[PDB]
């Protein structure tokens, strides 16, 4: 038995990136660079255990150096725990196999050679993990972990209806995605943000659109909204920045700043 | 089936470099520097699919150690930054500038190496790819890509007469090139531009002349015009600059400035 | 015969780290970095000899320089060498049973940040600065080398008093509670120090309870947290290199702020 | 078949260095820093006598040896070749900037240092290009257009070699040449010797037996510009300093 | 025949370090750093000591560049009741040095080592285990330099006539060494002095208590050498730089001589006028 | 046959350093740092051909081995093969050690072990440079007429060397001079007493060469830079020539 996904607290940005990829695997996978390592392996297992069967969904790990495990990985999840030194070309093929049919998930180690700029831009979204800063939230996690370690089944049962409610929303979102439309004016202003961010190519334009539709589908709507784009654009474009080294500005803050201007958002 | 060449939008400078080399392979090949994406590989496949049957053969040569007998074809070196055997690169340049005849195309990695003035001056033209900055154009490109991915054959058919029209223009330009002449005054003012740019050698003089003749041939003319030279001279000379490091001036902008002065464009 | 633990003078911070681990080994071990005129080899030997009999005495096992892979105390004299592979395996035996103790050399390879965070506490040894104490250590040391048995007898009842306190602390540890407000303020200190993960939260809580148990109390006190929090978090700092501040001094500074500890200015 | 030597335009300084070495190989070879590989074969094809053979060193008595990249092939191999020269064959070397600038102890041992500057006259650049393609299209009609000029220069080379033993330099000139070497702080007396051997070879080339101030003028930059010991505090061109000191010592208005 | 120890001029600080180790070998050896009469002084000290028996002359053992435990019978045993000179202890780093410091920290000996600057400073963990740090400064008195040279040629020409000229001084110094060894057990250091010695070590931020011990063993040995049984402030003054200057942990912001820093702090703590 | 020693012009400092070592080999050899190409190997051959009895010059190559006396040993590049082979040669010096080196420098610890440091500067007088070259080709064309032109001067110099060697035991230096020599070494911060000894041995050898048995202040003057300039411990904050510093301190101490 694995820690229930709906009980993981304090990782909202990473749970969003994983949920949107389950809804639209053509987003291109998630690169998880949480320099603060905490709840990385167990979150991805919780999400696999949460998905419905169609045979149960299978999660595959990227260990060893097999040249070629994409066999048992179709219509599933593939986790490469340390893709910071995993060959050099095998990474290229997996990023293609995810953008045309599985959920690519990658993790890295800080100070071991930060993702080479040619292989990180091909990742759909870039989710960073920062350890929870709210004190009473940190206490709740610790109190939850020992409470789970002592009595797994009373814990998993406590979240049983919340897991099923989220399980149905994933299915509904997958079913509704074909009807989800984004207005032309929004689709254009998304590209304006990609241009003003000096994104290398059009992949950033493509992922933001696929992500915004997948989020709107998740929330049971068929028209992409300005707020829908707001919640996915940092995940999609912050690792696609081409900023001058003379700038001390946060990448995620640069995308939010440019997004708010182009769309005219007052916070 | 491959994305049609005549549908590629926003890469005009590179499509020009590729078309001129297809018309006169003795130009010396194309070095493609710029955005990694923007389908550099797929444009060259599209151009191969467009050429007439004399089908033309497209060569990969990816990370190898000595695939070079496809004469009157195209050779794409995706990462000629990792041909640490410079001797492989050097022979491919001279053979491209003669019949040993093929269209050399190479791509490289910025900030990794190579690009050494000895390994860059021998490329005929230097085509730079800048990703489109106009928002509605980016949307149009994206809307075209999946439209091709969902229905390849209806997309290729929409461009079928334009593909055949461009195919006839390539053959015509190849056939007309022998009579294309350049005025002596232009030929001298071109050399004045190469000298005033302090280009290393006379190869820049040679490529600019061959490019201007090929462009006029493409457009069904037999007299090279100042506008013909205008459209090729940056492709030919910007990677042949010997500018002082004290200059914050764009290389391509330097070539345009000196061309305008020597020829007197106002 | 071994030098008696209750006779060691001038290592209070390190003796505290060892005693609390003996009381609660799930704290995660002690990393001993510092000076050489102490004898981390004989203080740990003294602590094994001080513990109660296990049925023979508790076994102290030493790991020499050339050491290949292969309820007591394990002393790893040089955990700088013996690459991450061997070091990783030992940390598993700890955490959630033996007291891991490691020592290191300065300038022989800085604390590997990923393998140092997994040590429970970080005790630094500073050689005694009080002149009359330095004389006392030397006079005691030669006095022990000439007549071990007369020396150990001078400290035999004090060894038994400390031995009973250790057992009492272990027996009482299950009833030891920490107030919710303290538990949250401990996590607030961990957050304000930007600690990597929640491991710092857990050992500080386990350490404060073990100290309160050592002193025969069942309620963790602000002062109880004060005496263990530097041992627990100073090697868990992520401070900017632009700061010339001592790590242990940074933990005390943030601890006093979060808990609001100030000196009464008496007339 | 090779492009004729007498048709090469715009390389006068390098053609002078090569002709003088062919006349007196004891000068010590040429360091060449637009296609010098064919210029040296053009010179090989031009010499008399079986025909002289030009040898390439990619990894030869009484001929020509061209070391294309004397920056690589470490001092060990380079040292050995310089012995064959000096006080007999024509050593020719070229070098690459940024590839291991020729060690200062290994560059001084070359007789002359000829620099190639690409032609700046527009109508000349056009003429060179038309000459290359005209040669590629019809080599033999090209070589024939230059056949009598090739034979004329071939006779001058033979005569110059035959006349060199009688060529003399005035004592006052020979001393002022040494003053130029001393005022330049040259490493040793090799500059005094090469400038003397070069001035005599040039005078012999022109059918004369007395070295002239003008003869020295035309050879002294080739001989001394790579032998300078100037302070790095000088933004002054090396070749211009040699002319400047030459003009002072000899008194050229 | 070897140059007589009592004739060596201008090495006073090193002669003091060597004599005290001969008097109390538990001091821990001498590290000789400085200008480059080093190999010849130690043999003279070996030649000066009184002739010993097999097991209840003193033997000098050297060590060339090649060690690799080709000493552990070998060479470690020939140093029994003798002296071991390590000519270049800045090379053969790590293990070989650690083993020798252990063998002198079945044969006990006076460890003496010399090193080369710029070719490696002995790793600070293995230099602190040397008892004392004696530096050799070449004599600056001109008329003294002439005497040293003139003594060298005078000895090279007539060894035996030279040794006789110093023979009674050798016997007097030999008797003082034996007496000092015999008197060492009674030599006491006052508690107030013993504490102020530790205060100097602390104010110098010395690594450990080894400096406290060496200064005390050295002060007693010097007082014993001079036929006294009470350590004096001047006794401590003459050994404290030998004992602590290689034990400094000084900030790199200080252009102060290490040996000179010890003198200043010693004068401060003890109140020397 | 080799170019005669007495015909070499413009190398007076190196000819002085070599002659004194031939007279008193215990001086410790010569380090020749001539930043100019002037035929260092052939001067040493010229000096060997000049000595009586015949003589023998060994020339060590770059590739030293693992193993000559009463002769001359020339180490053309004492930079290579320096770890131990250079160390071994300085120990064996009975023969006249001669070494040359190229800048871009021997171990500051292995250069102090050389007796004297003679620098070669290329002749700056124009009419002299011409004469050297004219002498070289004239010798290459007619060796025996050239060597005969210098034959008696070679014999005159040869006899002076024999006389100096034969007279050396009687050569004395005043005590006041000998102390002032040591005072110069002290103010130069010389490493050890090796500089004091060579300056004394060199001054005696020079006085013996000139047929005298009492060292003169000028005798010390002409050798002290050869002996002490490579034994300096001067601050890097000084833009002063090392050889010029020795002259400065010598002039003060002796009062010249």
Swiss-Prot record, chain A:
It comes from the Bacteria. GO terms for molecular function: ATP binding; ATP hydrolysis activity; magnesium chelatase activity. CDD domains: AAA. Its EC number is 6.6.1.1. ATP binds at residues 34-41. Belongs to the Mg-chelatase subunits D/I family. InterPro entries: AAA+_ATPase, CHLI-like, ChlI/MoxR_AAA_lid, Mg_chelatase_ATPase-isu, Mg_chelatse_chII-like_cat_dom, P-loop_NTPase. This is Magnesium-chelatase subunit ChlI. GO terms for biological process: chlorophyll biosynthetic process; photosynthesis. The keyword ATP-binding applies. Keywords: ATP-binding, Chlorophyll biosynthesis, Ligase, Nucleotide-binding, Photosynthesis. Involved in chlorophyll biosynthesis; introduces a magnesium ion into protoporphyrin IX to yield Mg-protoporphyrin IX. It catalyses: protoporphyrin IX + Mg(2+) + ATP + H2O = Mg-protoporphyrin IX + ADP + phosphate + 3 H(+). Pfam families: AAA_lid_2, Mg_chelatase. The gene is chlI. Gene3D superfamilies: Magnesium chelatase subunit I, C-Terminal domain, P-loop containing nucleotide triphosphate hydrolases. It comes from Synechocystis sp. (strain ATCC 27184 / PCC 6803 / Kazusa). It is an enzyme of class 6 (ligase). Pathway: Porphyrin-containing compound metabolism; chlorophyll biosynthesis.
Swiss-Prot record, chain B:
Pathway: Porphyrin-containing compound metabolism; chlorophyll biosynthesis. Gene3D superfamilies: Magnesium chelatase subunit I, C-Terminal domain, P-loop containing nucleotide triphosphate hydrolases. The keyword Nucleotide-binding applies. SMART domains: AAA. It catalyses: protoporphyrin IX + Mg(2+) + ATP + H2O = Mg-protoporphyrin IX + ADP + phosphate + 3 H(+). It comes from Synechocystis sp. (strain ATCC 27184 / PCC 6803 / Kazusa). It comes from the Bacteria. Involved in chlorophyll biosynthesis; introduces a magnesium ion into protoporphyrin IX to yield Mg-protoporphyrin IX. One of its GO terms (biological process) is chlorophyll biosynthetic process. CDD domains: AAA. It is an enzyme of class 6 (ligase). ATP binds at residues 34-41. One of its GO terms (molecular function) is ATP hydrolysis activity. Belongs to the Mg-chelatase subunits D/I family. Its EC number is 6.6.1.1. This is Magnesium-chelatase subunit ChlI. Keywords: ATP-binding, Chlorophyll biosynthesis, Ligase, Nucleotide-binding, Photosynthesis.
